[PDB]
Amino acid sequence: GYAFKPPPRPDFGTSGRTIKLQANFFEMDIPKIDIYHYELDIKPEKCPRRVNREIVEHMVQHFKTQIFGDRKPVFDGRKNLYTAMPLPIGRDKVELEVTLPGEGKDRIFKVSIKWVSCVSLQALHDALSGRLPSVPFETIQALDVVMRHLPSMRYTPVGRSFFTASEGCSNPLGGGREVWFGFHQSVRPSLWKMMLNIDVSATAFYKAQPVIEFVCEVLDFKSIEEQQKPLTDSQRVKFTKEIKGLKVEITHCGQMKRKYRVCNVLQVGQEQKHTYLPLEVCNIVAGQRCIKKLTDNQTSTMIRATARSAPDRQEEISKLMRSASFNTDPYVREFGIMVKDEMTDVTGRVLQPPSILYGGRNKAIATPVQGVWDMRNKQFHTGIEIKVWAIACFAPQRQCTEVHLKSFTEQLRKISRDAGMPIQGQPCFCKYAQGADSVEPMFRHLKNTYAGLQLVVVILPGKTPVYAEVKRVGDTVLGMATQCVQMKNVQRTTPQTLSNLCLKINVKLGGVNNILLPQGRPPVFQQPVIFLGADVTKPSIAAVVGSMDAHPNRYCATVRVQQHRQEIIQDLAAMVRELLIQFYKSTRFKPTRIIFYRAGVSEGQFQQVLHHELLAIREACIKLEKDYQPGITFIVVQKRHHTRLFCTDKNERVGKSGNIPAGTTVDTKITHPTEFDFYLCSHAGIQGTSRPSHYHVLWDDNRFSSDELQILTYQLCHTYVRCTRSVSIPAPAYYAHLVAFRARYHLVDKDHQALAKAVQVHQDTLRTMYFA
RNA sequence: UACAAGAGCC
RNA sequence: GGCUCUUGU
């Protein structure tokens, strides 16, 4: 039924200079054997995943000769149990009773092992060979979890990651926090091998040491003898918050050991048993995190403990590939899996960054220095005659101050005359309001008093719903376009920092700031073209931005509100109806090429977002004007993945980060062959960072060649408003993120009546922006 | 919310 | 979705 699939890729890329890169991939030889599948029905399910792993280890170490023998399984810690060899258990569902011995009451786990399937590895063989259209994910998770279970004992796995132990090292941080610098282990398909994907993770952990030192260090009370007088109930309530939910165990029973469960306060387990453990006998076994409670400065320095440069990331993943030694891993090499520790050789395509045209008096050309360029006193295309405008500071009055607002305004108009704006005069009204209570009479006063008001400036303290109320009022009620600055960019200013604000408020009303070179433009630009971008984000968010003209700066935005915990677009018809009628109003020309975008989508949701975000635009385009179906170039970006690219022996080291140069498209040998995709990194040296941006283009209507698509997408990265810094993701996707957050705030002041009473967006703002 | 880049947070 | 820091033009 789901025949509305992404098309196969028509042609590989050949443009630009070809580079031989070293990706974040590790070559490995995968055999043709079939991995079997078994299910674990665990009773009870109140125990966590680590307790399940310990009990499965107990029944291999206790019932070796009956279920397994020398053939041994591999384990996914919640339900799944895979094995490369044929286990001697078969169809027989043994409801094995795990008997951990105890003080009278033994810990009884009722687990049943049942054969489910024999997973054919020839399916993934046909997948990476290119003769299958789509790569299966169940078999890629089986190949992932082949290499989990032996490192599951040494590194306690949560999510799809690993949490390393202190291999001869130590780390204190304070407040009961330590960093467990493991790694995000993954495997991704390719052409030749299903090469491994290792990225460092480096998260926090709540250690594996008993609760005496915990009450020594977390409550900062190392001795209770000095605290002779007891405190109030607050330490008891904090004890109830923190101590409950952390598993302890006994060690006062000789060789007989077991693991206990904590649900009451320390009143371990039920109150009807005879095993109660005070603070002097509790021992916490590893595997406990995510129930953390501390201030965020430890989180920030823990983020610093992960923040590593790209050559440092090369050395760290190379050290991890040496020290963990997955070829020396016993059950992995018993499973027929061996890896190649050496970094791969991948063939890529570095791109010439396109020369842009800015208009104005000179109309000369500026070229990017590997994805980055500055205007540097070069006038843009269409400046806008700003005559009357207003300031409505909705921060408290001490923050937005008068002489600093005057110097911000003056340096804004002076750098905007340097960049080519005819800003006429000071703003007429500079009012200093308080908050979300009284937003409406002064907005009515600004609408009725100053006729033809062009822009209103709003100053905000931070994340607060006076912003939410002013955005809802300004884009639904009466209709002035609201641009918002915080004082953190007003108090400290640099010419870049306010030049980019003047070019945000340039396009806020509407105008053209940049145009690509007609010689440098792809042949899509010889026809009219609509650049579209979607975003899914307390009801939830539907928000889509489309452009206005062939000159790629003028856009406009739509907002709707949808039900929560849903990441689909369902009201797309009204959105792109408004976008294409505003295109028709803007240029008197129906655009011929649709360039769709969406930022931040899950990898498994692609067929459903294809189903609801291209059939909806098709039933909208039959509703706008008859015999009008422009070709859609649907590009779905990812921006969060564990797949990196590293420079070839530092041949072209750029920046202090040491990452790869900008535009380095890689489609062969590490990207998925069988579908329509490419990697792209349009970045520079920032913070110490290794990254691409996976532009998995999900639909091309007329099936243009991907050589044109990648250079058009690189240009569209260099058609942002803030194109002064490399924006890495083409412009309507990031506009869509802004307008998505806008729809989010549009409904916070409060079935769907509260939603339906504040969605009637005004006609005086849908021609303008409310997001940049 | 000048904008960007991304480690997780919890 | 959620923030919280670091480095930047």
mmCIF file with all atom_site columns, C-alpha atoms in Angstrom, chain A residues 270-379:
data_model
loop_
_atom_site.group_PDB
_atom_site.id
_atom_site.type_symbol
_atom_site.label_atom_id
_atom_site.label_alt_id
_atom_site.label_comp_id
_atom_site.label_asym_id
_atom_site.label_entity_id
_atom_site.label_seq_id
_atom_site.pdbx_PDB_ins_code
_atom_site.Cartn_x
_atom_site.Cartn_y
_atom_site.Cartn_z
_atom_site.occupancy
_atom_site.B_iso_or_equiv
_atom_site.pdbx_formal_charge
_atom_site.auth_seq_id
_atom_site.auth_comp_id
_atom_site.auth_asym_id
_atom_site.auth_atom_id
_atom_site.pdbx_PDB_model_num
ATOM 1   C CA . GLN A 1 270 ? 8.239  -4.378  49.887 1.00 0.00 ? 270 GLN A CA 1
ATOM 2   C CA . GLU A 1 271 ? 7.511  -3.748  53.564 1.00 0.00 ? 271 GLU A CA 1
ATOM 3   C CA . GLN A 1 272 ? 6.269  -7.328  54.069 1.00 0.00 ? 272 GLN A CA 1
ATOM 4   C CA . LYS A 1 273 ? 9.656  -9.002  53.525 1.00 0.00 ? 273 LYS A CA 1
ATOM 5   C CA . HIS A 1 274 ? 12.366 -9.536  56.149 1.00 0.00 ? 274 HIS A CA 1
ATOM 6   C CA . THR A 1 275 ? 15.233 -7.960  54.169 1.00 0.00 ? 275 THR A CA 1
ATOM 7   C CA . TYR A 1 276 ? 15.633 -4.305  55.145 1.00 0.00 ? 276 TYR A CA 1
ATOM 8   C CA . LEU A 1 277 ? 18.952 -2.623  54.363 1.00 0.00 ? 277 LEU A CA 1
ATOM 9   C CA . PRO A 1 278 ? 20.247 0.435   56.272 1.00 0.00 ? 278 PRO A CA 1
ATOM 10  C CA . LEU A 1 279 ? 22.771 2.890   54.840 1.00 0.00 ? 279 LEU A CA 1
ATOM 11  C CA . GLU A 1 280 ? 25.811 0.966   56.125 1.00 0.00 ? 280 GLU A CA 1
ATOM 12  C CA . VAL A 1 281 ? 25.165 -2.219  54.082 1.00 0.00 ? 281 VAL A CA 1
ATOM 13  C CA . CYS A 1 282 ? 23.846 -0.894  50.753 1.00 0.00 ? 282 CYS A CA 1
ATOM 14  C CA . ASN A 1 283 ? 26.045 -1.468  47.681 1.00 0.00 ? 283 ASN A CA 1
ATOM 15  C CA . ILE A 1 284 ? 25.118 0.159   44.360 1.00 0.00 ? 284 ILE A CA 1
ATOM 16  C CA . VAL A 1 285 ? 25.906 -1.896  41.246 1.00 0.00 ? 285 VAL A CA 1
ATOM 17  C CA . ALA A 1 286 ? 26.801 -0.033  38.018 1.00 0.00 ? 286 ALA A CA 1
ATOM 18  C CA . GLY A 1 287 ? 24.183 0.831   35.422 1.00 0.00 ? 287 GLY A CA 1
ATOM 19  C CA . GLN A 1 288 ? 22.464 3.722   37.240 1.00 0.00 ? 288 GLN A CA 1
ATOM 20  C CA . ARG A 1 289 ? 22.111 7.196   35.658 1.00 0.00 ? 289 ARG A CA 1
ATOM 21  C CA . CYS A 1 290 ? 19.457 9.570   34.120 1.00 0.00 ? 290 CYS A CA 1
ATOM 22  C CA . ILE A 1 291 ? 17.727 10.261  37.489 1.00 0.00 ? 291 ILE A CA 1
ATOM 23  C CA . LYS A 1 292 ? 20.322 12.992  38.076 1.00 0.00 ? 292 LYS A CA 1
ATOM 24  C CA . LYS A 1 293 ? 19.728 16.144  40.118 1.00 0.00 ? 293 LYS A CA 1
ATOM 25  C CA . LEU A 1 294 ? 22.475 18.793  40.141 1.00 0.00 ? 294 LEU A CA 1
ATOM 26  C CA . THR A 1 295 ? 23.142 22.319  38.912 1.00 0.00 ? 295 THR A CA 1
ATOM 27  C CA . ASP A 1 296 ? 23.985 22.761  35.247 1.00 0.00 ? 296 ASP A CA 1
ATOM 28  C CA . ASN A 1 297 ? 27.587 24.007  35.577 1.00 0.00 ? 297 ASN A CA 1
ATOM 29  C CA . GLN A 1 298 ? 28.705 20.395  36.026 1.00 0.00 ? 298 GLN A CA 1
ATOM 30  C CA . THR A 1 299 ? 26.687 19.637  32.878 1.00 0.00 ? 299 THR A CA 1
ATOM 31  C CA . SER A 1 300 ? 28.488 22.479  31.054 1.00 0.00 ? 300 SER A CA 1
ATOM 32  C CA . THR A 1 301 ? 31.974 21.313  32.040 1.00 0.00 ? 301 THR A CA 1
ATOM 33  C CA . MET A 1 302 ? 30.884 17.749  31.186 1.00 0.00 ? 302 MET A CA 1
ATOM 34  C CA . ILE A 1 303 ? 29.969 19.145  27.742 1.00 0.00 ? 303 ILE A CA 1
ATOM 35  C CA . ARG A 1 304 ? 33.491 20.629  27.669 1.00 0.00 ? 304 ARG A CA 1
ATOM 36  C CA . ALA A 1 305 ? 34.782 17.110  28.480 1.00 0.00 ? 305 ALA A CA 1
ATOM 37  C CA . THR A 1 306 ? 33.178 15.912  25.215 1.00 0.00 ? 306 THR A CA 1
ATOM 38  C CA . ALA A 1 307 ? 34.095 19.030  23.166 1.00 0.00 ? 307 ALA A CA 1
ATOM 39  C CA . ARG A 1 308 ? 37.075 17.724  21.213 1.00 0.00 ? 308 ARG A CA 1
ATOM 40  C CA . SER A 1 309 ? 38.606 18.931  17.953 1.00 0.00 ? 309 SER A CA 1
ATOM 41  C CA . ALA A 1 310 ? 38.532 16.899  14.731 1.00 0.00 ? 310 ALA A CA 1
ATOM 42  C CA . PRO A 1 311 ? 42.213 15.755  14.861 1.00 0.00 ? 311 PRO A CA 1
ATOM 43  C CA . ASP A 1 312 ? 41.621 15.056  18.551 1.00 0.00 ? 312 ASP A CA 1
ATOM 44  C CA . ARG A 1 313 ? 38.491 13.128  17.520 1.00 0.00 ? 313 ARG A CA 1
ATOM 45  C CA . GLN A 1 314 ? 40.654 11.224  15.018 1.00 0.00 ? 314 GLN A CA 1
ATOM 46  C CA . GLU A 1 315 ? 43.115 10.286  17.768 1.00 0.00 ? 315 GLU A CA 1
ATOM 47  C CA . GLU A 1 316 ? 40.308 9.396   20.202 1.00 0.00 ? 316 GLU A CA 1
ATOM 48  C CA . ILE A 1 317 ? 38.401 7.104   17.822 1.00 0.00 ? 317 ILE A CA 1
ATOM 49  C CA . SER A 1 318 ? 41.725 5.596   16.668 1.00 0.00 ? 318 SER A CA 1
ATOM 50  C CA . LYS A 1 319 ? 42.696 4.992   20.320 1.00 0.00 ? 319 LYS A CA 1
ATOM 51  C CA . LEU A 1 320 ? 39.248 3.468   20.908 1.00 0.00 ? 320 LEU A CA 1
ATOM 52  C CA . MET A 1 321 ? 39.625 1.221   17.863 1.00 0.00 ? 321 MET A CA 1
ATOM 53  C CA . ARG A 1 322 ? 43.049 0.133   19.152 1.00 0.00 ? 322 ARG A CA 1
ATOM 54  C CA . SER A 1 323 ? 42.243 -0.330  22.844 1.00 0.00 ? 323 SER A CA 1
ATOM 55  C CA . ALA A 1 324 ? 38.818 -1.989  22.628 1.00 0.00 ? 324 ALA A CA 1
ATOM 56  C CA . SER A 1 325 ? 40.276 -4.346  19.970 1.00 0.00 ? 325 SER A CA 1
ATOM 57  C CA . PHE A 1 326 ? 37.139 -5.738  18.361 1.00 0.00 ? 326 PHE A CA 1
ATOM 58  C CA . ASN A 1 327 ? 39.172 -8.266  16.363 1.00 0.00 ? 327 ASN A CA 1
ATOM 59  C CA . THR A 1 328 ? 40.537 -9.545  19.697 1.00 0.00 ? 328 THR A CA 1
ATOM 60  C CA . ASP A 1 329 ? 36.918 -9.659  20.976 1.00 0.00 ? 329 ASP A CA 1
ATOM 61  C CA . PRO A 1 330 ? 36.245 -13.397 21.448 1.00 0.00 ? 330 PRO A CA 1
ATOM 62  C CA . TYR A 1 331 ? 32.558 -13.804 20.699 1.00 0.00 ? 331 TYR A CA 1
ATOM 63  C CA . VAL A 1 332 ? 32.677 -11.349 17.784 1.00 0.00 ? 332 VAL A CA 1
ATOM 64  C CA . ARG A 1 333 ? 35.410 -13.339 16.025 1.00 0.00 ? 333 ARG A CA 1
ATOM 65  C CA . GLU A 1 334 ? 33.495 -16.471 16.997 1.00 0.00 ? 334 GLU A CA 1
ATOM 66  C CA . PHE A 1 335 ? 30.473 -14.885 15.273 1.00 0.00 ? 335 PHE A CA 1
ATOM 67  C CA . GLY A 1 336 ? 32.406 -14.629 11.990 1.00 0.00 ? 336 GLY A CA 1
ATOM 68  C CA . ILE A 1 337 ? 32.859 -10.858 12.316 1.00 0.00 ? 337 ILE A CA 1
ATOM 69  C CA . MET A 1 338 ? 36.249 -9.207  11.939 1.00 0.00 ? 338 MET A CA 1
ATOM 70  C CA . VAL A 1 339 ? 36.923 -5.501  11.460 1.00 0.00 ? 339 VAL A CA 1
ATOM 71  C CA . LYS A 1 340 ? 39.688 -3.415  9.897  1.00 0.00 ? 340 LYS A CA 1
ATOM 72  C CA . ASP A 1 341 ? 41.022 -0.950  12.466 1.00 0.00 ? 341 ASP A CA 1
ATOM 73  C CA . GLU A 1 342 ? 42.390 1.411   9.780  1.00 0.00 ? 342 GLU A CA 1
ATOM 74  C CA . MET A 1 343 ? 40.392 4.459   8.708  1.00 0.00 ? 343 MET A CA 1
ATOM 75  C CA . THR A 1 344 ? 38.616 4.030   5.387  1.00 0.00 ? 344 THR A CA 1
ATOM 76  C CA . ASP A 1 345 ? 39.210 5.576   1.970  1.00 0.00 ? 345 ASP A CA 1
ATOM 77  C CA . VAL A 1 346 ? 36.115 7.371   0.662  1.00 0.00 ? 346 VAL A CA 1
ATOM 78  C CA . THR A 1 347 ? 35.831 9.340   -2.593 1.00 0.00 ? 347 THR A CA 1
ATOM 79  C CA . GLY A 1 348 ? 34.252 12.777  -2.242 1.00 0.00 ? 348 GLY A CA 1
ATOM 80  C CA . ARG A 1 349 ? 33.600 15.996  -4.161 1.00 0.00 ? 349 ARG A CA 1
ATOM 81  C CA . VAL A 1 350 ? 34.765 19.379  -2.847 1.00 0.00 ? 350 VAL A CA 1
ATOM 82  C CA . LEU A 1 351 ? 32.808 22.250  -4.373 1.00 0.00 ? 351 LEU A CA 1
ATOM 83  C CA . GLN A 1 352 ? 33.700 25.739  -5.573 1.00 0.00 ? 352 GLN A CA 1
ATOM 84  C CA . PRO A 1 353 ? 31.712 28.130  -3.348 1.00 0.00 ? 353 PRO A CA 1
ATOM 85  C CA . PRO A 1 354 ? 29.555 30.232  -5.658 1.00 0.00 ? 354 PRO A CA 1
ATOM 86  C CA . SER A 1 355 ? 30.208 33.898  -6.241 1.00 0.00 ? 355 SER A CA 1
ATOM 87  C CA . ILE A 1 356 ? 27.253 36.020  -5.159 1.00 0.00 ? 356 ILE A CA 1
ATOM 88  C CA . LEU A 1 357 ? 26.013 39.331  -6.531 1.00 0.00 ? 357 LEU A CA 1
ATOM 89  C CA . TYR A 1 358 ? 24.995 42.177  -4.255 1.00 0.00 ? 358 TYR A CA 1
ATOM 90  C CA . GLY A 1 359 ? 23.238 45.122  -5.848 1.00 0.00 ? 359 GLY A CA 1
ATOM 91  C CA . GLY A 1 360 ? 23.407 48.773  -4.886 1.00 0.00 ? 360 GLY A CA 1
ATOM 92  C CA . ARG A 1 361 ? 25.717 51.370  -6.410 1.00 0.00 ? 361 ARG A CA 1
ATOM 93  C CA . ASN A 1 362 ? 28.615 49.089  -7.380 1.00 0.00 ? 362 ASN A CA 1
ATOM 94  C CA . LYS A 1 363 ? 26.836 45.802  -8.315 1.00 0.00 ? 363 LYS A CA 1
ATOM 95  C CA . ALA A 1 364 ? 30.115 43.924  -7.967 1.00 0.00 ? 364 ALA A CA 1
ATOM 96  C CA . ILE A 1 365 ? 30.914 40.360  -6.958 1.00 0.00 ? 365 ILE A CA 1
ATOM 97  C CA . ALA A 1 366 ? 32.062 38.747  -3.716 1.00 0.00 ? 366 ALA A CA 1
ATOM 98  C CA . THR A 1 367 ? 33.282 35.133  -3.538 1.00 0.00 ? 367 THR A CA 1
ATOM 99  C CA . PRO A 1 368 ? 33.252 32.874  -0.442 1.00 0.00 ? 368 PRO A CA 1
ATOM 100 C CA . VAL A 1 369 ? 36.460 31.712  1.227  1.00 0.00 ? 369 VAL A CA 1
ATOM 101 C CA . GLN A 1 370 ? 35.344 28.068  1.657  1.00 0.00 ? 370 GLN A CA 1
ATOM 102 C CA . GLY A 1 371 ? 31.731 28.681  2.611  1.00 0.00 ? 371 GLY A CA 1
ATOM 103 C CA . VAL A 1 372 ? 32.203 32.009  4.451  1.00 0.00 ? 372 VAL A CA 1
ATOM 104 C CA . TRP A 1 373 ? 32.136 35.535  3.038  1.00 0.00 ? 373 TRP A CA 1
ATOM 105 C CA . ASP A 1 374 ? 31.540 39.004  4.394  1.00 0.00 ? 374 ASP A CA 1
ATOM 106 C CA . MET A 1 375 ? 29.864 41.866  2.555  1.00 0.00 ? 375 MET A CA 1
ATOM 107 C CA . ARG A 1 376 ? 32.456 44.439  3.795  1.00 0.00 ? 376 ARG A CA 1
ATOM 108 C CA . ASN A 1 377 ? 30.729 47.723  2.817  1.00 0.00 ? 377 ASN A CA 1
ATOM 109 C CA . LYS A 1 378 ? 29.054 46.281  -0.288 1.00 0.00 ? 378 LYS A CA 1
ATOM 110 C CA . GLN A 1 379 ? 25.464 47.386  -0.891 1.00 0.00 ? 379 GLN A CA 1
#
